[PDB]
Amino acid sequence: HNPYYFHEHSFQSRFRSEDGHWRVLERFSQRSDVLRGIENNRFAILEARPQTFIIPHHLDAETVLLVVRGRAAITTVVQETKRESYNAERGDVMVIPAGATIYLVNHENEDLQIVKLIQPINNPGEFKDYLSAGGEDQSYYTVFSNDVLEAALDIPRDRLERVFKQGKIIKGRALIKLENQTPVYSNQYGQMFEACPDEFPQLQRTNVAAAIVDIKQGGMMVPHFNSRATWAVFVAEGAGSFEMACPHLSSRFERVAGHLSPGGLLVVPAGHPIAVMASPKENLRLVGFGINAQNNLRNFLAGKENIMNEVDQEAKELTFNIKGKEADEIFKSQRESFFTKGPVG
Amino acid sequence: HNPYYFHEHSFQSRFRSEDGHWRVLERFSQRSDVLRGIENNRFAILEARPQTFIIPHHLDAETVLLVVRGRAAITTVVQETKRESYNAERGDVMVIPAGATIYLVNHENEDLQIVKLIQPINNPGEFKDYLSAGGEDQSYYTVFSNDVLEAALDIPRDRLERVFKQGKIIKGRALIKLENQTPVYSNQYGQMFEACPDEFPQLQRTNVAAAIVDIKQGGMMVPHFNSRATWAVFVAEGAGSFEMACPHLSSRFERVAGHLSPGGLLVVPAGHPIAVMASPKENLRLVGFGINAQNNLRNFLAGKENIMNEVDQEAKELTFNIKGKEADEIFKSQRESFFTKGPVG
Amino acid sequence: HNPYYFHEHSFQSRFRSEDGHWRVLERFSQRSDVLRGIENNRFAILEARPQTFIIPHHLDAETVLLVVRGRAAITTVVQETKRESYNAERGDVMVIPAGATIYLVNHENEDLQIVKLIQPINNPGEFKDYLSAGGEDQSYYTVFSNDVLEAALDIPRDRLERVFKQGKIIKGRALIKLENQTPVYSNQYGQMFEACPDEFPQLQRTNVAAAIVDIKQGGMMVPHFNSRATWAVFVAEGAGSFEMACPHLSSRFERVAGHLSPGGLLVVPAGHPIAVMASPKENLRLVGFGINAQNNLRNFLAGKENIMNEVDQEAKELTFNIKGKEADEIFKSQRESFFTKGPVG
Ligand SMILES: [Cu+2]
Ligand SMILES: [Cu+2]
Ligand SMILES: [Cu+2]
């Protein structure tokens, strides 16, 4: 009865090794139908234990990187050929071209969490991992004929047999630091940082936008919706809950309700009205990428600055049960904007 | 034997209330196959009796508005938040973003017809209607928990129970006035007004172009076709008929023939040669939107200015049965261009 | 066991007449699945014997023309109406809009080969041919009512019965000359000419890029891959062979191997590592169009200038079995770049 929320476990696992876990959430078209326009997107995550390394690789796919926890040092290379390497702490955003080869090192004493947004460039809603070391079958040097390897590298074939044979995580104007930006919505009850294509050319490729939201203890992000963007948001830390009105689940809306437990992913389509509560005990951080966000507007149904306030009184009078001015009693009554103090029970 | 034409009745109805009728034509992939590249488009219409109001709402979808009959006053709002309201008479074009909330009033003593072109932003070829009042299930305030409503609006929950509870049509650089523009084709036998993306940034989003065609009594729009654009055209007023050559219905063309009765919709794919007759009795107005029109050329097979005239004689000589000059006897013989006097019988 | 390669015969034939052969390769979704993101593309070819003519026509589809063998004179017209005609020798590239009408003449004493890349504008991965002469069913004048023809052209209907009745190949800032451009990769062992969207606005439409590759006798194009572009490449002249590592054929790579015999087509998806050998006896020319190439990078796994060289030593040390410097022994050892001397046996 609730399609839009995926659990920790619903992640299709990729690796599961001591040094790290790299796993991708299944596409949006197994399970549901109502998610289609985002199907060429895949949400994935990465974990790498302290003192870890990740092999040089690439994807036939576009990646949007957002680091959740810890720290790592990133490197991207392409081809005349150029090198770019960066410092990644919590709340960093990177836009990694398809075919662009990248490695990384987690040199740090606690874990490293990284959330990727991957758009397959080849087969729609299907991507993969092109890798330098592993398997009898797993290297893009290792698998090739020794005659063509030996020819190509200009070195003796038995000597090749000792280097490129002898998975990905082992022991050890591109980036923009997201959390180091200016919150579009802050107040007291929570803060939201956002990087969008309209301000950031590097995003215009991947089509998407990147964000990080915090809602304080017992806070709330008021009912509202996204113009165009379809957001996929992951639960970084904490717990909470949400209500979203769904027409598909015949324009009658049924309420979609649920709790956000750590390591979950919620999908919030364009124009979907949503309100979010950050729970009695702890705070809640959501971290995640919107699909299709360009000139995407967020419109609020409550709070001081919202859409109602900007409508003529007559509209309000005919629409609801309220008067020419007495409308303002109702919609200016939330003294805060965006986030405010939420429900109980 | 004729896919491209839909009747009045083939419209999937939405409302059917005294004050108004809002209905959407089914997509193009029930029935046929040959219409695919336009499937993410949906043609819809709106009728609102005199002294009528339409609720604030939005769609997860892009809308291209063209008013057919009568008059109405339009309003759009989004979110810092801004208001835009406009005057709409016959032949007005508006481009309404997804998620952008809009209301309208028909204050006028005759009916109001409005034709919408809707592109689903969420689920391809599937859109919907996000609404403020109706149902036990039908409001995006009404359905939400009173605890989150009460929290969010900062007002007592029983007091909420008397306002947001107590369908859409009830009793009561965005727009450009299309009919007030300059006809690309006029002569005597008919006049055609067109607004295209290449001249109009607001269209570049929605990808489409907007047009209104009049063909006089017994007039004709000569055989021709659209470069790229796939046109969906509705029959505003009058009656008439058409011939269009279809290869799908194996490059052998079969003739597609039919009559345009009021309230119909014809689809004319890119490169589809078409000729149109405005009938013995009355005139014919077509009103409608082209899909995929950018730098879209219209090429004419007859009439003074047309494509043949600009080809070398040798081509014409080898191609048809005609001579080096005697080709010009054949293709300059229509003394008019575009529209001319049509057939009989 | 090898999807990516199509034979001469796998071409869906269109015409087969003495004066010419026009045939289109079937789409990429009969046979395989792994080719999807290119399905709206169709590769086609054209052959026209000496002293031949091709009718004025158009497609509901975008064409990218590359001439292989011989010579022909090209003409394009659209609509106010304009004419453009050009000289085409071996290695010429043209970008032909949908709906744009075109004819051609092979006036020359040997054959004429032309490779087209066609993107359906109407029905995805489905295009067609709009033609002036043939059939009882085959003309877009011939099929139309005489009443509407006679009306439209302003000439007597029996007189129409003697001109437009009395297939396509019969007896007889748009173009850029590709082979007359500057090779991006040359050395001795082979030369590669390329025209891309990023340098050529006319390509930005069709989305694609155009190329011609020569690999000398016993030459090789070293293992490498394309960032974004999915290349479809045809075998102009000669023979040869290739190895490409495929993950789909579960990130374990299996080697895809084969021989390129004349008149074949190979598909090389984005990020697919490939090495190519030009065979013991003759040389090898590949001719063809990349899909989705914008800012598409080609990255090399061997050869003096390649991606490894630009990575830090520590990466190389952890990755492979090699030392801080002794890495450079391995990857700078190919004294050439791009093409070099290949295997034997
Ligand atoms: Cu929904
Ligand atoms: Cu057709
Ligand atoms: Cu593959």
Residue numbers in the entry:
A (entry chain A), B (entry chain A), C (entry chain A): 46 to 124, 128 to 214, 220 to 225, 248 to 324, 333 to 428
According to the publication:
Vicilins are trimeric protein expressed by multiple structural genes and their extensive post-translational processing (glycosylation and protease action) results in a high degree of polymorphism. In this study, we have structurally and functionally characterized a 52 kDa protein from the seeds of Mc. The crystal structure of Momordica charantia 7S (Mc7S) globulin showed maximum homology to 7S vicilins.
The crystal structure of protein was determined at a final resolution of 3.1 Å. It belongs to P63 space group and has a single monomer in an asymmetric unit. The monomer of Mc7S comprises of two cupin fold polypeptide chain separated by a pseudo-dyad axis of symmetry as observed in the other 7S family members. The trimer was observed when the three monomer molecules were arranged in the form of an equilateral triangle where their extended α-helix regions interact with the other monomer in a head-to-tail fashion. The Fo-Fc map showed the clear electron density near the tyrosine (Tyr49) from the N-terminal domain and the cysteine (Cys321), and two histidines (His323 and His355) from the C-terminal domain. The copper ion is placed slightly away from the centre of the trigonal plane formed by SG of Cys321, ND1 of His323, and the NE2 of His374. The metal possesses a trigonal planar geometry with copper in the centre as inferred from CheckMyMetal server. The acetate interacts with NE2 atom of His299 and ND2 atom of Asn301 through its O atom.
